[PDB]
């Protein structure tokens, strides 16, 4: 069996780098070229506790991409609920507002893995996921990369654990771009320095541009047009979204524009997810 | 090569009289022969930012008969980047917001995931238009030459005028426009009726003209429910061929009693929908259809 | 099928050969499944009042057949004009509402389509699973030793289940509940009226080695000491203390695998009211 077979996937940090490698080829494979049916008579409950239509939406055509169906709830005792939902379910997307939960219905769910669509505020592995695949995809790999991360480093969900999991690969450079209120935490420098992994800091995007291949955009420190004169060829900018005020409209046009394609792909790494946890074989 | 392949179903007056027909010679032919496999392997978004539970069941059932599935929400961010995104996943996307315009919205996307309008801020219905036309030309085997009253408030529903817009596409159609006055159909209306030299007549009771119409169209305050309320006492000395039509709900503008009668199809009018639907995802999905 | 475009109102009003029906499709469909049975077919989900368990083991057993889904999980217009619409659109409708009687009155205006009630006002198919639960374990639904066990009095559950097993022949039922918590005497008036055998008592151990079936509606795994091979102990859900946690470890344990076989005895209902065979 591949080694997620059957697997709960909580936390993005329980994927070995083997592993995480493994998930980005299968959603490669995906997106060049669709398997309408791998899980042609599976049944998949979708089950947002908490509203997340961008989140929800995405799972679910994801399931459906792949030939499945879907139960669910699109908003609001756990244990014997999924105890019961496990009975008639071959995998549960689960999407909580306390942290923890989605581990909970893991403990009860017995040989029915549970995909966590988001625990809580930081914990959200397919986002990270999509994250990875999207550097992968329109850079060729996940090594020897510029990698800017602009706006909130301190409360920015998204950023510690993309921060972490490309930490894991060799020769990237982080460009921390933020307020001195918002800085990337310490714990997170810490690791880097331990590592050996470059990282420095600067008080805008202005000086840097030139040197990334990767701008991520976090949910003044606006990135607009003008600020992407003299990019590299190759630069992508991303964002999790939603965007407000962050990236003016003016960017959507440019070249380095990828943050609906970076959503986009997330169709693709959680085919990948879904596809690995419930086929033995792929 | 058809004309509405990967176009934006924005508003019913952008569709000429032939594109009209297309819609509902296809409506027709998947009312006779259903195609449940047409879109086999599309996923087509059903988003609705207010609840229109009829509407919704309608397109949403629509999309399964042709073998399609369906993602969506049933009930901050800028409307065109939800759709960027959403353009990214899915094939097509059915859309409705009590807020914004679905025609600001469209002009920013190309068709190649085309955009049907299920109702917008600006009360453009196209769908609802042309489940009504496929209506009344099923009923009365043609759209021309056709005596239809429209009873009710004729100046604030978008829809009736729509209805309105489209008829006058056809030939030797005759209006009876019966409402009070503060609800008149508009002088926007009339001026292009006259253009075109299409009659029309005012009448201040439904008595007056029952017995000429094909079509009773009523629309969805004491005095106005009062006196135009429809009762099946009302439909003495009709027409055979005659089909009370309403786009629902009806609260009190028709009685219970007349859904008994031969003339009631406003029910039909309803399940109509399910094929004009039908026919518009089809024909912005597929290049060529035979 | 006798069954065949029937609108499932009440579970009690299908006679024992209906019910043997719908527990022999449903085994059958336990076994082997058929997941292209209903393709093509568009069936309603009408939650008017939420009931998400109910809801998706339904929706489950309609995907399990092949069949899509359309529906809404809760929310004047009458509910007749609502179904009138509706029922032009489907080819069955599963409805849950809170008015007594709504499925009746859907039914009145849904023409051939179908009305499977999920729940009209004061609830229900859960009777259907504990049936085909008792059959498949106990491999019959005659001669069956039974004890229900906690409130009695306003446990519509036990109710329905008492009025459908009394349609077997030599059951026997042990009502187990406080004095202010007793089975109604119509009930019992029934059952005395049919010659079923039927006996009260204060407290659970002390009739376990009798049982067959255990329903409950205060357990743990000490009073199931002297238990029968065959037992199942078993529970509609969602329990809270009634039964403790150290049950679930035991054998008789049952009351899960009795929740998934709502999937095939739902499957079951729909298949027969949809297809002649």
Do not use: W
Request: with cysteine; glycine share 4%; hydrophobic share 40%.
């Amino acid at each position: 069996a591949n080694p997620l077979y059957h697997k709960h996937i909580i936390s993005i940090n329980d994927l070995s780098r083997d592993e995480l490698e493994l998930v980005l080829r299968t959603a490669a494979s995906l997106k060049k070229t669709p398997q309408p049916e791998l899980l042609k008579h599976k049944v998949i409950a979708s089950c947002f506790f908490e509203a997340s239509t961008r989140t929800r939406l995405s799972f679910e055509t994801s399931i459906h991409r792949l030939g499945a169906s879907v139960v669910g709830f699109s908003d609001s005792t756990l244990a014997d609920t999924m105890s019961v939902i496990s009975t008639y379910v071959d995998a549960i997307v689960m999407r909580h507002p306390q942290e923890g939960a989605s581990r909970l219905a893991a403990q009860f769910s017995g040989n029915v893995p549970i995909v966590n669509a988001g625990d809580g505020a930081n914990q959200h592995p397919t986002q990270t996921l999509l994250d990875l695949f999207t550097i992968q995809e329109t850079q060729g790999r996940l090594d020897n990369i510029n990698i800017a991360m602009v706006g909130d480093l301190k409360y920015g969900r998204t950023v510690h654990s993309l921060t972490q999991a490309l930490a894991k690969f060799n020769g990237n450079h982080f460009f921390f771009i933020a307020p001195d209120a918002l800085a990337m935490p310490a714990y997170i420098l810490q690791m880097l320095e331990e590592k050996e992994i470059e990282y420095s800091l600067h008080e805008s995007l202005e000086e840097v541009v030139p040197e990334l291949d990767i701008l991520y955009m976090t949910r003044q420190f606006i990135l607009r047009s003008s600020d992407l004169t003299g990019a590299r060829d190759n630069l992508k900018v991303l964002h999790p979204l939603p965007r407000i005020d962050e990236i003016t409209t003016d960017v959507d046009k440019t070249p380095y524009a990828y943050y609906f394609q970076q959503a986009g792909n997330g169709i693709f790494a959680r085919q990948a997810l879904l596809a690995l946890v419930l086929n033995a074989e792929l």
